[PDB]
């Protein structure tokens, strides 16, 4: 038999709940040809006035200072508590 009604009872019986979310799972809500032609938004630039590269430095501060030739490198990495969602 290939009828879905009787088979869906068998797959639900043999370990765990199934029915919904199939193996193929490409029936509904799969949009073909994506969408109607969209307009991509512009960032903090594009709009004129006060768009100088003097303000937007990017690659300017890069020169390495030569140093010298009790102190820690950072405050010590404190351990985090166990997860609230699942203890174990």
């Amino acid at each position: 038999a290939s009828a879905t009604r009787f088979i869906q009872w068998l797959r639900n019986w043999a370990s765990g709940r199934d029915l919904q979310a199939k193996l193929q799972l490409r029936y509904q809500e799969i949009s073909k040809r994506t969408q109607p032609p969209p307009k991509l938004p512009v960032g903090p630039s594009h709009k004129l006035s006060n768009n100088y590269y003097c303000t937007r430095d990017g690659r300017r501060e890069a020169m390495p200072p030569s140093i010298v030739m009790a102190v820690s490198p950072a405050p010590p990495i404190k351990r985090w508590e166990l997860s609230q969602d699942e203890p174990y």
Binding site: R11, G16, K22, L23, L40, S83, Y88
Partner: protein
């Protein structure tokens, strides 16, 4: 945020010990392992019969090299060598010459498939949009000579795929 893996011996006395001992005297977990495979058999196989059904693809896909042209004839490529410099495999070879009538175009244009890792930089570095990557797989050959594409002669044979190319480029301008 610190999860744990080990349960540290869940069995204590009588009820919690014997059921854990049951899955070693008899099996049960083998039957539980059988159960997941049983439900997996009854659900339909997700298979695609290749010569009749085809696998899902994108509007912007890279696989086959073909150079496009304008609607009123005329070779779109300009011989900037721009696509040559970006090419990470250094696959695309180009010799430029004037076409004796003012216009600056191509003479030699070999994109060998012995090289090229199908990265699609030449598709995205071309200012004139000459090389557009056609969604094709049908190019398996017997020899190297049959595989490596010659000076435009096999690339302007990509005009046979230009009906798809002109439709698929409608996702490129104003990106996706």
């Amino acid at each position: 945020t610190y999860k744990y893996v080990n349960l540290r011996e869940p069995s204590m006395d009588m009820k919690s010990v014997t059921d854990r001992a049951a899955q070693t005297l008899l099996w049960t977990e083998l039957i539980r392992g059988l159960g997941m495979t049983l439900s997996y058999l009854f659900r339909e196989p997700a298979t695609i019969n290749y010569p009749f059904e085809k696998g899902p693809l994108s509007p912007r896909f890279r696989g086959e090299h073909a150079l496009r042209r304008y609607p009123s004839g005329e070779e779109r490529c300009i011989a900037c060598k721009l696509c040559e410099a970006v090419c990470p495999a250094q696959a695309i070879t180009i010799e430029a010459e004037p076409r004796a009538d003012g216009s600056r175009r191509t003479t030699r244009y070999d994109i060998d498939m012995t090289k090229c890792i199908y990265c699609g930089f030449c598709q995205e570095a071309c200012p004139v949009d000459a090389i557009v990557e056609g969604p094709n797989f049908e190019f398996s050959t017997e020899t190297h000579e049959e595989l490596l594409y010659n000076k435009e002669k096999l690339l302007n044979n990509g005009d046979k795929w230009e009906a798809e190319i002109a439709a698929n480029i409608q996702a490129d301008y104003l990106y996706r």
